[PDB]
């Protein structure tokens, strides 16, 4: 897999050149601490995110838990909870690395074809991923609503800036969007 820095190396090697834009690399390093806060915000809340995302997918489409639905019976609901956790894990890896290589290569490559072969609905999966994308955005910004969390609300206590890591939110969101693109 690549990270943000080995991505710059691979790009440079296409012209057998040294990496000369050290300023960009220094910018990556300066956002290092906030990046670690963003990964900690997702990993620390992953169980709440997965169960809420899969429950949300199901409350919007009740057929998933009726005759012939793909979260029926118990075995399929369990398999689906597992897949939502796996996808979220590979997205958190990509955010920690600052590069989608690990997500693309180890999770998304052949996912659509696997789901096609199993009869797993890509539509309903895309909805679960949309909810996790929204959850991740809120946890990175440390602004989860009490309305959607109730007694499960968590505050991370990262040091606040005005933009609330808008750039990391966009990056995280772009990784979830690669999942959605891979299934769409």
Determine if 98 is a binding residue for its own copies (CB under 8 A): no
For residues 106 and 90, the answer to whether their CB atoms sit within 8 Å is yes
For residues 84 and 128, the answer to whether their CB atoms sit within 8 Å is yes
Options 11, 55, 114, 170; binder of other proteins; rule CB under 8 A: 55
- CA 179 – CA 175 distance, rounded (Å): 7
DSSP assignment string, 39-95: HHHHHHTHHHHHHHHHHHHHHH-GGGGSTT-TT-SHHHHHHHHHHHHHHHHHHHHHH
* Phi (first) and psi of residue 28, to 5 degrees: -55, -50
Indicate which of other proteins, its own copies, ligand PEB, none lies near residue 108 (CB less than 5 to 8 Å, by partner kind).
Answer: none
Indicate which of other proteins, ligand PEB, its own copies, none lies near residue 11 (CB less than 5 to 8 Å, by partner kind).
Answer: its own copies
Burial of residue 69, with CB atoms counted within 10 A of its CB: 0-12 exposed, 13-18 middle, 19 or more buried: middle
Determine if 40 is a binding residue for other proteins (CB under 8 A): yes
- CA 156 – CA 45 distance, rounded (Å): 10
Q: Is 144 helix (H, G, I), strand (E, B) or coil?
A: coil
Residues that bind ligand PEB (CB under 6 A): 31, 33-34, 36-38, 40, 45, 48-49, 52, 54-56, 59, 64, 70-71, 76, 79-80, 83-84, 86-87, 106-107, 111, 114, 118, 120-121, 124-125, 128, 130-131, 134-135, 138-142, 144-145, 147-149, 152-154, 158-161, 164-165, 168
Determine if 124 is a binding residue for its own copies (CB under 8 A): yes
Q: What residues make contact with other proteins under the rule CB under 8 A? A: 1-3, 5-6, 8-10, 12-13, 16-20, 22, 25-26, 29, 32-33, 35-36, 39-40, 42-48, 50-51, 54-55, 73-79, 81-82, 89, 92-93, 96-97, 102, 106, 150-151, 154, 156-157, 159
């Amino acid at each position: 897999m690549l990270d943000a820095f080995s991505r710059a190396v691979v790009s440079a090697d296409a012209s057998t050149s040294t990496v000369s834009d050290i300023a960009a690399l220094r910018a990556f390093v300066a956002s290092g601490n906030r990046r670690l806060d963003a990964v900690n915000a997702i990993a620390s809340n992953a169980s709440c995110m997965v169960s809420d995302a899969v429950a949300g997918m199901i409350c919007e489409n009740q057929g998933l838990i009726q005759a012939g639905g793909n979260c029926y019976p118990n075995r399929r609901m369990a398999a689906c909870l597992r897949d939502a956790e796996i996808i979220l894990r590979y997205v958190t890896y990509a955010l920690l690395a600052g590069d989608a290589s690990v997500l693309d290569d180890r999770c998304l490559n052949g996912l659509k074809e696997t789901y096609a072969a199993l009869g797993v609905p890509t539509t309903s999966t895309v909805r679960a991923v949309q909810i996790m994308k929204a959850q991740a955005a809120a946890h990175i910004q440390d602004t989860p609503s009490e309305a959607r969390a109730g007694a499960k609300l968590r505050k991370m206590g990262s040091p606040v800036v005005e933009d609330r890591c808008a750039s990391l939110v966009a990056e995280a969101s772009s990784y979830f969007d690669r999942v959605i693109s891979a299934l769409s």
